[PDB]
Write a protein that binds this ligand. Structure first.
Ligand SMILES: [Mg+2]
Lengths: 1316, 613
RNA sequence: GCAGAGGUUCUAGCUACACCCUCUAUAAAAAACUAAGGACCACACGA
DNA sequence: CTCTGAATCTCTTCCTCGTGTGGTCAGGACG
DNA sequence: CGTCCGAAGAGATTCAGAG
């Protein structure tokens, strides 16, 4: 079955491989995260209520009064999305939190509270995400890109090589809390364990163990296996186990029960070990030298006096052996040391450690953390327990705890947030084992270790910062203030938390400014994953290994779509199928695979999980019974491609397109073009600007429909139904009876936004895509948004393209464009620029908004109105005055030079208490009338739908059809009905209709109040006049033209239509491209795209010819059926016989301009299929047609490649770049250019340019650029006077910047002077 | 405020933002000559406003400068004519934003155009290292007569044909014109109008334009070749030289002095560079400039006539490629089985797999190349004849217009092993070429190297900028103060040897360098070269004839001049064909010459005699 | 036209980068005309 | 017992020009 | 109305083996 829009135009779909999973909602990541963040959760995890539960003790210190959270609710936003956007105020939902304060009677914490105080406090104004997924912060859309940061937990970095310069490896362990102080352990080149916290000075790692109150002997027991020595008359015979013997040469002969197993100086054999185990003798003779090398495990004290014979962890000596024999202790404990594997690292780092007691360790830790302050025992203890044992100051997230346990291989998944002593000692043991050889260092670049921090988590963290600051303030106030003095509202101040949240949303490295020029750009930016941001890597600190794509990024982030420039690979976009896990780790949908069958159920797999399993290739042929037709199929098990058997396979890729992102997938033939060119093309797609009419891509991925539907620009019907009324401003749908709600459903109404400015100054315009009486199904595209055609994302206009050099006009990357392109306005793009003039309260009286201006032409004043504001719809050019403003004693806003356009609308916002001008009052009253009329029309449309639903029911109950007519239309309750469920339904609808009349008048009054009240303004201004210029940008030489495959080039010249090369049919080629680019940069897909577009246009031309002449519907029907079949099997298998033969004519009417073709990203059309497509049309299968020169007329030898190709006009237009200036306003350094800006100024002549002139034999021109052109006030004035005099003379003088340098050095206290 | 990039030094003293600067995107504009560049009308208006005001006051059209500004704002007709007068002979500097080397900024004689985009002459765009992709160039306007004259004498493009780094010309044809020249200078065994004799280049052009005779066909033609052997005189030589119609047409373009041998060949990019270098050395600067402009025009026109289009069918997959892949699969399977049996260790198994995959890659590359050029067959009036390919891809690769052999292999042959980000070679190479469909895992392996290369390019340009800054700053304390140092001591120059063929012949190394001592002919006690003579092209060729091995050469290090470097010690400037002029800044020239390739630079027994001697 | 003011316009116009005339203590026969001041940090993008 | 060569600890930037977007001590009441 | 609160390397600076 096909939806009606799918019926209107159906893309021919290549690709044999079916998809088991539909593409997920592209914006599901941000929307779902924010939905979790605001949703009330009784469970209280990963939400706002979770933050409240985490931080609201509010316990007064000894005051016995505490405030406890109960509930929080988000009030409806004061302003709607459109109203807040036009006003400039943030789209925010007021946050009112119910809080209960209870007062315990003094001196008895166990006693119940004397009273309970209940109130609701409005704390903080939190932004609310729009349905499109963008926050509105200052009238401008903003979406905070999800942050890719290293997940909390313990990590082990090899740090091999550069450390110690001797090639030694220095293993370090980092315990990174989600919020708190980092804990790091590091191996010295001397192999001593040192601990560094928060990048402080390195300190012996044992010191924390002392701070853990662990005794030294307990430490040595924990980190070493004790070896027991028994005082024996036979020279201290020692209990030895054969296991310790392995890995070490025999320093002494090993004999037990009279049998020597390993000889002196002989390597110990595993056979000897097994023989000794078979003998199973615990005690083995040992010489005096062996115990000398060993280290005593625990302290030993003389029995007679209690003095210690041997200190703990002290090297043995012969006299020490004599002393311990004097002690006579039966059990002697010695550390096991294996040079090969089991190094005694704790021993040496303990020798280095200078503290023998807990208190000294705490003192040293306090000195390290707070140098310059005297240590205090209680203060040091509190500092340490706050650093590592306190929940409030140190917090490890649940994901952090899980990663920590998994790295430590602990069985439990969830544990306490606070770091504990056992956790630290286990980390040290793991690091020691890593140093020994057991285990391996984990990779930070591994995406399993790097979780994605969505917008919800960041908002929660900022909210927690606000909450903890508010909590400290309330704790300070509550203890000071007497109990029951005031209702617990004044103690909570909304300003700190509100300011924190507003600061995060408005001004943040992650709160990127929205790029709204393309729906593809909008989706890509929301899906974008950025390593940059708070708590994340900066651009400079980012390592090379981070930028490079790790093999685990497969199916999780797009390796192709990464922004080139300063941040490469750091800002990689999320792949299309990827979904974040609840812990934040990336998950890729993978099909479950039975031994012989590819099972249909899909299991999401994390990055770490896919390592264990083996994952099949997406491009694996299937027998449709689940069996791979190939006995050996390529697979990615350990991150490396390798052949595998069918039975071995445990998982299969969900689709061929899971590796590429939304932006990258849209490029057809992505497998054919180079990865670098694909990257550049995917970047160029986001930079396209919508044209005046969107044109479907004849060659497309097939995900254009998904992008358009998921993007917020496209208006999709909430409930399917017939369209009773369609209009450019609005579309009204009569909902179907089945899909409509039983009560109050009415009929749906959608208000399309007209031409409005974007954040990138591109028009947003929803053009209706349906006609009156056209049925619309559920989830169907209603109107085409920007760059959208029939629900298909159409970024640019495709046109005939010929690959051939043309007299050098397309030299290496340049592009030649026919005059026909300009003539039919294919790339004319509406650009909307907003200019704001603000009346500022100033000294000498406020600046007036009057029309009258001193020293201006009357012709310029003619365009303005009486009140001083340009008439709506007027045409203005560069230099004209839009709104007249006079400085107190001139300041009238003026069109920037070069900009020429018409004013779509003028909106004026006035502060409360200051009178609105005549034009402002007229605008306000027109707005009131417009809103009232729209609202009343909405009410009467709802009345029509309500009556229509009710009308169908009056047939039952004995009510006559004629009797209904006499009764007034507005009220139908008077007519009585037989009692039934339908009668009760009508009664409920009538009561609801009366209530809706009351609600309608109330809502009209509320809208009037919203419009009537003067808009809030920044302090110091009276009223702000916003005027919008609509400029139609014709395609111009110097504009940037880029295809989807990555071929970018400027339009060198607008060649006349006659000059353009033409084929034998006579159609001149629209664009002429340089073929030489194709071999150098292997974007061979663009040639394949050109051939496929040629085939599509050939089919379209045949259909058009069949439509130009009156042809039987059957003929077009069979032709289109053959076109969709097209030889090789395809997934679509669309049947024309299903169509009603009236839909066939409309489908052909859509197809005549061109035939859409769906090419899967990696399973796209093969060359043979393209050849068959060409053979189906009259066009040659070779893809190259003899082409005739437009001027000479002689057909070119070696027939060129000509075909239709998709081409996007980039917003990088020439007119915006052009910035020539003679003289401009200077800075305080008096360097005249004042920075390169849209405002007039000059380009920088930087250091390398000065070097270039110096290398040349050029000195005078360099002297000019240095002094007379830039920063010589006398020099500049004299130069200008001389030039206008006609004599070009130069006076050197001194640069003002040099005097600035002299004065600055003088300020440093260094005397610098110029010798005479 | 003092130190760092943001410090006042580098922000506002070393490099100062300047007035009369215009910035806009680049455009080709092939119609322009070498010294002329396109300039938008509004951009020239804004840049030249003071000159326009002065000329308006001189004309008497506007009595006051305020009246002149009002006239400019009105943009009336007389303002345009005034703008025409000032623009006519007033050079402007075209400057790409990253000025890697000296040729980064070059003056041009502006030509007013209707539009908003600056047009840069195609030949110099290679020297500017500028593409046509939203690339923007700053346009600075010299003000004083010293400045305009300075730009015309030095900054102008026609004045500096040779790059300072090396004697090779920098305005060499790059993409389209080189392709057109290659298309003209090719022979097809059978073509229209073959085997007829032609009176001269004029008749060849007339035959081609009439269309009865094909552009490339072997025809005997009469050519009036001129020789420079006569001292300051040209002697005409008339002979019947076998050639193609295209080559004969091209001959009328070249100046008289150049011989026919240079144009007789296929004229690849290196061949055209050598042609321009010989023209510069023999005819002089002005004939070289005229010839360069004319050759660019002809290359563009005949490339447009050729229609050398890139197509899918143009690329050919080798028929032997599938068999080679099957054989390599059998070999890797055998090595895998040996690893399973334990006969071969994992490391040696991986090494053998990599080696055999590389061998298969080389074999499929050879098969692909043979299918490109050898496979082309067309008759010679007999049964069959084999000729060099006219396939578009092979024409682009062989001529050197764009790409290289390796990229052609990537397009049609097997791509080859792709490295993992750590640098280790992936065991399984990418079997499918770019023309065929590419597997998902294959694309992932490719994008590993692609992202690695992009990050490498970023670090390359960063480190190259730092190195260029350091090189300039250690440099710039060197100017040619003294004409002759008069020191006998100098460095010995011999051809560089690394055990193989000599990387650089002695002639190229010693070229442009004044001898430290009078060298001796192989005949003993003969003064082949005087002590202090500069080595020009004919002199160096004479040195090759005598086949000298070691030549003592004056070096800047050997020069004992204080705070300066001798002109004779430095040698030829390499900017133009003479000893370096006194006072010129050698240090900055050399620093920029070293720094400029930094972007192209990557970031990362027994003895057998080659020949008898 | 170099220190100020006045003049036919339009509060004020003495070269302020700046537009006309007068003189060294007094104000008008006269048409083209008028304005000289302002940074950093972050994000994204192009090369 | 006094320096040796070595290992560790501290400065110092780490391209170069555009074009657009936004955010920026905040004194605060009192004589 | 005015007025007072990663990485790479170079260099210095310890540092420490060895007569
Ligand atoms: Mg470029």
């Amino acid at each position: 079955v096909y939806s009606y829009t799918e019926k209107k135009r159906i893309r021919k779909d290549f690709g044999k491989r079916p998809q088991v999973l539909d593409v997920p909602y592209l914006l599901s990541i941000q929307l779902d995260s924010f939905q979790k963040f605001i949703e009330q959760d009784p469970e209280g995890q990963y939400g706002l209520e979770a933050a409240f539960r985490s931080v609201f003790p509010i316990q007064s210190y000894s005051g016995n009064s505490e405030l406890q959270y109960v509930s929080y609710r988000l009030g409806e936003p004061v302003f709607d999305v459109q109203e807040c956007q036009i006003r400039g105020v943030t789209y925010s939902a007021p946050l009112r939190v119910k809080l209960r304060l209870v007062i315990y009677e003094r001196e008895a914490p166990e006693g119940t509270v004397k009273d309970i105080k209940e109130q609701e406090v409005y704390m903080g104004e939190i932004p609310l995400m729009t349905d499109n997924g963008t926050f509105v912060i200052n009238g401008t859309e903003r979406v905070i890109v999800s942050q890719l940061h290293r997940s909390p937990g313990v990590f082990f970095d090899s740090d091999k090589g550069k450390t110690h310069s001797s090639g030694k490896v220095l293993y370090n362990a980092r315990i990174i809390p989600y919020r708190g102080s980092w804990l790091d352990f590091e191996f010295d080149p001397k192999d001593n364990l040192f601990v560094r916290i928060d990048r402080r000075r390195k300190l012996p790692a044992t010191i924390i163990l002392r701070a853990l109150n662990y005794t030294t002997e307990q430490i040595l027991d924990l980190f070493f296996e004790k070896v027991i020595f028994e005082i024996r008359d036979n020279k201290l015979q020692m209990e030895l186990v054969p296991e310790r013997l392995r890995g070490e040469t025999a320093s002494f002969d090993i004999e037990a029960n009279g049998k020597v197993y390993v000889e002196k100086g002989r390597r110990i054999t595993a056979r000897h070990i097994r023989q000794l185990e078979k003998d199973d003798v615990k005690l083995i003779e040992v010489p005096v030298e062996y115990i000398a090398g060993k280290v005593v495990a625990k302290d030993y004290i003389d029995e007679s006096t209690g003095e210690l014979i041997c200190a703990a962890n002290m090297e043995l000596s012969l006299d020490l052996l004599a002393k311990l024999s004097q002690s006579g202790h039966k059990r002697i404990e010695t550390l096991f040391t294996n040079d090969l594997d089991h190094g005694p690292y704790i021993s040496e780092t303990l020798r280095v450690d200078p503290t023998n007691d807990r208190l000294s360790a705490l003192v040293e830790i306090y000195r390290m953390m707070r140098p310059g302050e005297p240590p205090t025992r209680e203060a040091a203890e509190s500092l340490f327990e706050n650093l590592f044992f306190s929940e409030d100051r140190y917090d490890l997230s649940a994901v952090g705890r899980m990663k920590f346990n998994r790295s430590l291989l602990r069985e439990e998944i969830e544990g306490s947030g606070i770091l504990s002593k056992d956790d630290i000692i286990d980390v040290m043991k793991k690091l020691i084992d890593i140093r020994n050889g057991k285990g391996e260092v984990d990779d930070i670049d591994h995406l399993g270790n790097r979780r994605i921090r969505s917008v919800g988590e960041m908002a929660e963290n900022q909210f927690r910062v606000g909450l903890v600051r508010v909590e400290r303030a309330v704790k300070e106030r509550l203890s000071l203030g007497d109990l029951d003095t005031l209702m617990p509202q004044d103690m909570i101040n909304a300003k700190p938390i509100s300011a924190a949240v507003k600061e995060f949303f408005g001004s943040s490295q992650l709160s990127q400014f929205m790029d709204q020029n393309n729906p593809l750009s909008e989706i890509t930016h929301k899906r974008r994953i950025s390593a940059l941001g708070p708590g994340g890597l900066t651009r400079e600190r980012a390592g090379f290994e981070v930028r490079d794509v790790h093999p685990t990024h497969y199916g999780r982030v797009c390796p192709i779509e990464t922004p080139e420039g300063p941040n490469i690979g750091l800002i990689n976009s999320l792949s299309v199928y990827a979904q974040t896990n609840e812990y934040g780790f990336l998950e890729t949908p993978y099909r479950k695979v039975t031994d012989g069958v590819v099972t249909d159920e899909i299991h999401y797999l994390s990055a770490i999980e896919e390592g264990n399993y083996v994952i099949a290739q997406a491009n694996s042929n299937l027998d449709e019974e689940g069996h791979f037709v190939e006995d050996l199929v390529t697979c990615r098990s350990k991150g490396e491609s390798s052949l595998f058997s069918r039975d071995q396979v445990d998982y299969m890729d969900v689709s061929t397109q899971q590796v590429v992102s939304v932006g990258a997938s849209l490029i057809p033939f992505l497998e054919h073009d180079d990865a670098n060119r694909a990257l550049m093309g995917a970047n160029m797609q986001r930079q396209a600007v919508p044209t005046l009419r969107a044109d479907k891509p004849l060659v497309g991925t097939g995900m254009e429909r998904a992008v358009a539907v998921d993007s917020g620009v496209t208006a999709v019907a909430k409930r399917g139904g017939v369209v009773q009324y369609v209009d450019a401003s609005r579309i009204v749908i009569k909902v179907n009876e089945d899909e409509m709600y039983p009560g109050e459903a009415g009929i749906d109404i959608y208000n399309l936004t007209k031409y409005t400015r974007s954040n990138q100054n591109t028009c947003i315009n929803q053009m209706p895509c349906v006609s009156l009486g056209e049925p619309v199904e559920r989830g169907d595209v209603l109107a085409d948004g920007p760059s959208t055609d029939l629900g298909e994302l159409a970024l640019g206009q495709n046109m005939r393209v010929a690959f051939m050099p043309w007299n050098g006009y397309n030299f290496e990357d340049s592009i030649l464009v026919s005059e026909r392109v300009v003539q039919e306005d294919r790339f004319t793009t509406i650009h909307i620029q907003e200019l704001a003039c603000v009346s500022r309260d100033t000294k000498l009286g406020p600046e007036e908004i009057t029309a009258d201006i001193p020293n201006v032409g009357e012709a310029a004043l003619s365009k303005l109105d009486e009140s001083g504001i340009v008439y709506i719809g007027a045409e203005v050019t560069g230099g004209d005055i839009l709104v007249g403003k006079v400085t107190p004693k001139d300041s009238s806003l003026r069109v920037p030079n070069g900009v020429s356009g018409t004013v779509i609308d003028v909106q004026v916002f006035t502060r409360d208490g200051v009178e609105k001008d005549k034009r402002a009052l007229e605008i306000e009253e027109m707005q009131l009338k417009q809103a009232k009329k729209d609202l009343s029309e909405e009410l009467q449309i709802l009345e029509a739908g309500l009556f229509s639903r009710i009308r169908a029911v009056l047939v039952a109950g004995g009510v006559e059809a004629e009797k209904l007519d006499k009764l007034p239309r507005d009220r139908w309750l008077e007519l009585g009905l037989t009692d039934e469920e339908k009668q009760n339904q009508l009664e409920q609808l009538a009561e609801q209709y009366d209530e809706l009349k009351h609600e309608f008048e109330k809502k009209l009054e509320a809208k009037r109040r919203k419009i009537t009240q003067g808009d809030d303004l920044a302090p110091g201004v009276l009223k702000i006049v916003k005027v919008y210029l609509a400029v139609k940008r014709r395609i111009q030489p110097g504009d940037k033209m880029a295809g989807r495959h990555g071929n970018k080039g400027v339009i060198s010249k607008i060649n006349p239509i006659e000059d353009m090369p033409y084929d034998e049919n006579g159609t001149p080629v629209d664009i002429v491209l340089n073929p030489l680019g194709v071999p150098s940069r292997m974007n061979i897909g663009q040639i394949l795209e050109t051939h496929l577009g040629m085939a599509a246009k050939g089919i379209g031309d045949k259909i058009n010819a069949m439509l130009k002449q009156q042809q039987e519907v059957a003929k077009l029907r069979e032709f289109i059926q053959r076109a969709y079949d097209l030889g090789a099997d395809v997934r679509q298998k669309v049947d024309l016989s299903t169509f009603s033969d009236e839909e066939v004519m409309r489908l052909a009417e859509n197809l005549r301009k061109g035939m859409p073709i769906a090419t899967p990203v990696f399973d796209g059309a093969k060359e043979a299929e393209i050849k068959e497509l060409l053979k189906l049309g009259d066009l040659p299968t070779s893809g190259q047609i003899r082409l005739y020169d437009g001027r000479t007329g002689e057909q070119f030898e070696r027939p060129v490649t000509v075909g239709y190709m998709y081409m996007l006009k980039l917003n990088h237009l020439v007119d915006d770049k052009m910035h020539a200036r003679s003289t401009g306003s200077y800075s305080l350094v008096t360097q005249q250019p004042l920075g390169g800006k849209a405002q007039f100024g000059g380009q920088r002549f930087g250091e390398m340019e000065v070097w270039a002139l110096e290398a040349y034999g050029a000195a005078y021109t360099l002297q000019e650029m240095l002094t007379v052109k830039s920063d010589d006030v006398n020099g500049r004035t004299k130069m200008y006077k001389n030039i206008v005099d006609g004599n070009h003379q130069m006076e050197p003088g001194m640069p003002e910047s040099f005097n600035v340098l002299l004065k600055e050095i003088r300020s440093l206290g260094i005397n610098i002077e110029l010798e005479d | 405020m003092i130190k760092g990039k943001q410090g006042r030094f580098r922000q506002n003293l070393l490099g100062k933002r300047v007035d009369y600067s215009g910035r806009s995107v680049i455009t080709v504009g092939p119609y322009l000559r070498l010294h002329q560049c396109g300039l938008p009308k509004k951009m020239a208006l804004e840049l030249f406003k003071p000159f326009i005001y002065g000329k308006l006051e001189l004309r008497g059209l506007a009595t006051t400068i305020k009246a002149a500004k009002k006239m400019v704002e009105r943009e009336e007709a007389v303002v345009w004519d005034i703008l025409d007068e000032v623009i006519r002979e007033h050079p402007v500097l075209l400057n790409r934003a990253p000025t890697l080397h000296r040729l980064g900024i070059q003056a041009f004689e502006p030509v007013l155009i209707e539009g908003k985009a600056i047009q840069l002459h195609p030949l110099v765009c290679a020297a500017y290292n500028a593409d046509f992709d939203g690339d923007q160039m700053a346009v600075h306007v010299p003000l004083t007569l010293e400045a305009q004259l300075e730009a015309r004498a030095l900054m102008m493009s026609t004045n500096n044909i040779l790059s300072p780094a090396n004697g090779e010309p920098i305005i060499v044809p790059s993409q389209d014109v080189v392709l057109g020249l290659y298309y003209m200078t090719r022979d097809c065994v059978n073509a229209k109008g073959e085997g007829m004799v032609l009176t001269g280049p004029k008749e060849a052009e007339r035959l081609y334009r009439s269309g009865l005779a094909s552009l490339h066909a072997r025809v005997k033609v009469r050519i009036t070749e001129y020789e420079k052997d006569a001292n300051g005189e040209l002697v005409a030589k008339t002979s019947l030289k076998d050639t193609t119609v295209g080559r004969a047409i091209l001959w009328m373009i070249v100046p008289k002095g150049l011989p026919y041998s240079i144009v007789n060949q296929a004229l690849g990019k290196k061949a055209i560079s050598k042609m321009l270098n010989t023209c510069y050395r023999i005819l002089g600067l002005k004939p070289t400039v005229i010839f360069a402009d004319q050759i660019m025009y002809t290359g563009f026109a005949y490339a447009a006539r050729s229609g050398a289009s890139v197509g899918i069918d143009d690329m050919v997959i080798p028929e032997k490629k599938h068999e080679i892949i099957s054989e390599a699969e059998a070999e890797v399977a055998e090595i895998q089985e040996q690893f399973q049996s334990g006969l071969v260790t994992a490391g040696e198994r991986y090494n053998k797999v990599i080696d055999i995959w590389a061998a298969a890659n080389d074999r499929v590359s050879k098969a692909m190349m043979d299918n490109l050029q050898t496979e082309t067959v067309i008759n010679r009036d007999g049964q069959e004849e084999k000729q060099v390919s006219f396939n578009s891809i092979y024409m682009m690769a062989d001529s050197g217009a764009r790409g290289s052999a390796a990229q052609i292999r990537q397009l049609a042959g097997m791509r080859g092993l792709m490295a993992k980000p750590d640098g280790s070679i992936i065991e399984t190479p990418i079997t499918a070429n770019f023309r065929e469909g590419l597997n998902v895992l294959q694309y992932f392996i490719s994008t590993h190297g692609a992202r690695k290369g992009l990050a490498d390019t970023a670090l390359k340009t960063a480190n190259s900028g730092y190195l260029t800054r350091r090189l300039v700053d250690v440099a710039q304390d060197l100017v040619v103060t003294e004409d002759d140092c008069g020191t006998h001591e100098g460095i010995m120059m011999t051809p560089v040897i690394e055990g193989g063929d000599v990387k650089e012949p002695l002639r190229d190394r010693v070229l442009g360098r004044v001898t430290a001592e009078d060298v001796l002919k192989p005949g003993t006690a003969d003064i082949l070269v005087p002590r202090n003579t500069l080595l020009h092209e004919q002199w160096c060729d004479l040195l090759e004839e005598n086949s000298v091995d070691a030549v003592k050469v004056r070096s800047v290090v050997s020069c004992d001049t204080d705070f300066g470097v001798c002109a004779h010690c430095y040698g030829r400037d390499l900017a133009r064909g003479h000893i370096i002029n006194k006072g010129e800044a050698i240090g900055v020239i050399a620093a920029q010459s070293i720094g400029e390739p930094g972007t192209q630079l990557t970031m990362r027994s027994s003895i057998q005699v080659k020949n008898k001697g």
